[PDB]
Amino acid sequence: SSSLGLLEQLAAGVQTNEPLLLVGETGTGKTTTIQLLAGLLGQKVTVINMSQQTESSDMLGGALVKAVRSGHWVLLDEINLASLETLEPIGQLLSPHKNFRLFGCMNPEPSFRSRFTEIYVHDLLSIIQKYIGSNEHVIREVAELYQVAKSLSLDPHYTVRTLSRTLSYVTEIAPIYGLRRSLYEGFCMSFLTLLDHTSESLLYNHVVRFTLGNRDQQNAILKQIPKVPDYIAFCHYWLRRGQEHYIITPFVQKNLLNIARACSTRMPILIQGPTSSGKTSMIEYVAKKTGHKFVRINNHEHTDLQEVEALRNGYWIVLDELNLAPTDVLEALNRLLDDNRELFIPQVLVKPHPEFMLFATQNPGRKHLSRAFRNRFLEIHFENELETILHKRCKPSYAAKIVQVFRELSLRRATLRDLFRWAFREAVGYQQLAENGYMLLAERARDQKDKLAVQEVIEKVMSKVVWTRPMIRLFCLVWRCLLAKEPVLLVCGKTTVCQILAECLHKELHIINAHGDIIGAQRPVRRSAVNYSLHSQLCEKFIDDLIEKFEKLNLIERQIIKHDGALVTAMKDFFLLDEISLADDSVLERLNSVLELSRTLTLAVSLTAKDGFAFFATMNPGGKKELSPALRNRFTEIWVPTEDILKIVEGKLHNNKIELARPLVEYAKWHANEYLYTDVISIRDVLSAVEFINACEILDLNLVLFNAVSMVFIDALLASLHAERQRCFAKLNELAH
C-alpha cells in the first residue's frame, strides 16, 4: 500500500509535467521510479548518477540534452550530494519537448530544492518469498529469516536491504555446495561479518540451526563433503572455482582467512582495518591457492589514471589504500563499478573471468571514504595469543612478561609493531637487559617525564664538535637505531647529532628542508649539449646536414633527445628530511611505502633497494600538523630537551678567558626569568655570546662581558626598559648621518 501511494504520487506528478524528487534511506525510490516507469510504459530510465561527474558532463561538452531531444526519463539521482550544478536547474527552468520525465531522486540546496515538487518516501515474508522461492521446511525458514530481520532490532549497523543481497547470495550458493539451512547460515555469515558481538551470531545460527534440525547438527553443518562434491575446492564450507608460502596461520588468522574465502567465490569486496595486520597478507595467502596473483595497486595520495591488465588477464587486482584516493580515480573507479567487468578507455570493455576484485580502506579523519562506496560492495572488517605469536617470529619468561607488560601498559594508559621491534631488537639473554631494552624502546617516545616514570614503574613490576651529557642520550639512541636500521624520527641539537653520526659512520648526509617530489623523483628536461654533439660528429664518419648524411649512410639519438631524486640519490646514504611534519602527503605516502622493512621507487615503476638509506628525519614540536598515527608510529621517534651549561661554555670559550661566562651564565638566567619569563638557558643566545666573548680583541674582561651582554641580551630587550637596562646593568654589576 505504501508502494501504491508512492506510485500514485509519482503518477500525479507525471501527469502535470513538474519536477519531482524523493528523499529517503533505501536506494529504492529509484527502484520505485524504474518500476512505475516500465509499469506505465518505460520511456528510458536515463539514470544519471549525478554525484561524480560534477557539473558539465551532465549538461554539455550532454546526457540531459540527449534525453530532452530523445524522450528518456532523467532520473537525476543523489542530488543531495552534488556541487553547484545549477545549470541543471536552469534547464529545468527552461520548461522544446513532448513528454520528458525529470524524476530526480534525492536521499536525505536552497533554490534547486525549492523548485522541484518533492514527495518524500515513507512483509519481509513477501520479499523473502520473491527472493527465495525454492518446502514447508523452507516456510519455517521464511519464519526464521523473518526472525532475523526482526531481530535486526538487537542494537546502518546491519541496515535494511543488506538482507536483500544476503538472500541473493543465498540463492547463489544454494545448489552450489549448499543445504538451504546451510545457505541461510552463509547469508547470516555475511550479515554478521562486520559486527560487535557474536551473540547475534549465536542467535542467527540458533534460528538457522533450529530450521536445519544440535552440537552434532552444527558439526553436520561442517560436513563439507557433499558440499565439495560438485572448480578447485578449498577446505571446509568452501569449494571455490579453479602454491603455498612461509605464511604460517594461527587460529584467528585462519578464521578471518576462511571469512575472506567465503567471500571469495561469489562476485566487489572491500576489507578495512589496520594496515600492519596484513590485509593483503591474507589476500595473497588465499591467492596462493591459485585463484590468481595479488596485484596490489598501492595508490598513495595523488595516484592518477596512469597507474586493465587484471581486467584482461586474471591476476586479481586490489586497488589498495583507497581511503586516500586522489578524488577522481575514485570517481572513475566507481564508474567502473557500474558495469561488472567492462572498462572503456580510448577500447570498450574487458568482461573478465574470475580472479577477485578486492579493495582495502583503513581503520576509520584523513579523507573518509564514500558511504555510497561503502554500500556498493560486500564489505569486510578485521594476551596469550600474543604470547604464542611472538614465540616463533622472535626467538619462557622474558617473552611472556613482555606481553604481560603490554597488557600492563594498556591497563595504565603503544604500538605492538614496536613490541616486535622490542623483541627482535632485544639480543639480551638477560631479563634485566631485556627489561632495559623494552624500557628504552618504550622510553623512546616520551613526550613527558610523567608517563615515562609511569612506564618505568610498570616495567619495574616486571670531529669538529663538542661532547655533552644531555645530548649523549640522543646520540646513543640514534646510534643504536642506526645499527637496527629502523626508521628514526626526532621531535636543541638535532642536526648536530645527525652530522655527528655522519661524521662517525663516514657517510654523505644528504639533508633537505621542509616545503618535494624531487626528494623522491624528478622529471626535468634532459643542460650542456652544444659542442658535445659537434665533437661527436667530429668523431664520426663524414653540421646538421652532415649528421643527416651520416644517418643515411647513439650520439645522434642522444642529440635528438635534447628520474633522479633525493632518497634515490641516497639510495645511490642517509636522508635527513628535516621538519617532516610540514612535508608533503603523497611523498609521505611513498615514504610510508619506503618505511616498513623495504624500499620502493614508485616511478612504469620499480622498487628501490636499501644499503643504509636511513630516513633519519626530524620534526620539531608544537601549520604543525602531525602525520597519520601510523606514519608517526611507523618510525621510531625520539624526544629531547644547570651549571654544566656553564661548563659547556667553558669548553666553548677561549683559552684563559674564564669567569666571564660564569657571570654570563647567571646573567642569562636573570635575563631569562626577567625578560620572557621561563627557565630555559636559551643556548642560541649564550652561544653567540661565547662567540663574541672569545672574539673579544680588546682587554678589560668585565668590559668585554659588558659590551657582550649589551650586544646579545640587553639591547635586544617603554623608556623604563632603559631603566631596566640599568637593572640589567645591575645584574651585570652584580656579575662585576
Residues making up the binding site for ATP? 24-31, 273-280, 492-495
C-alpha distance from residue 735 to each of 329, 441, 661, 671, 705 (Å): 69, 44, 10, 12, 10
- Give the SS3 label for residue 576: strand
C-alpha distance from residue 669 to each of 385, 493, 652 (Å): 54, 20, 18
> Residue 54 has which C-alpha cell?
560534477
* Angle, vertex CA 162, rays to CA 119 and CA 38, nearest 5: 45
The closest alpha carbon to 83, from 65, 58, 105, belongs to: 58
459-480 per-residue burial string, b: 16 or more CB within 10 A, e: under 16: beebeeeeebeebeebbebbeb
Backbone angles phi, psi at 291, to 5 degrees: -60, -50
Query: Inter-axis angle of helices 431-442 and 449-461, to 10 degrees?
Result: 160
CA distance 356 to 287: 9
Backbone angles phi, psi at 74, to 5 degrees: -85, 85
CA distance 181 to 208: 6
Q: How many CB atoms within 10 Å of residue 539?
A: 8
> Residue 575 has which C-alpha cell?
636522508
Contacts of residue 27, defined as CB under 8 A and 6 or more positions apart, other chains included, come to 107, 161, 375
Contacts of residue 411, defined as CB under 8 A and 6 or more positions apart, other chains included, come to none
3-state secondary structure 167-227: HHHHHHCCCCCCCHHHHHHHHHHCCCCCCCCCHHHHHHHHHHHHHHCCHHHHHHHCCCCCC
CA distance 691 to 708: 10
DSSP 601: B
User: Do the Cβ atoms of 399 and 424 come closer than 8 Å?
Assistant: no
The C-alpha cell 572513475 sits at 332
User: Do the Cβ atoms of 350 and 342 come closer than 8 Å?
Assistant: yes
Q: How many CB atoms within 10 Å of residue 330?
A: 20
Q: What is the DSSP string of 688-712?
A: HHHHHHTT--SS-HHHHHHHHHIII
Residue 717 C-alpha from the chain's centroid: 47
CA distance 448 to 309: 52
Q: What is the DSSP string of 491-505?
A: ---HHHHHHHHHHHT
Q: How many CB atoms within 10 Å of residue 426?
A: 21
> Residue 578 has which C-alpha cell?
628535516
CA distance 702 to 732: 9
Q: Are strands 574-577 and 509-512 parallel, antiparallel or unpaired?
A: parallel
> Residue 141 has which C-alpha cell?
525458514
CA distance 189 to 337: 24
Instruction: Specify the length of the chain in residues.
Output: 737
Residues belonging to the binding site are 24-31, 273-280, 492-495
Query: First CA to last CA across the chain, in angstroms?
Result: 96
Q: How many CB atoms within 10 Å of residue 210?
A: 15
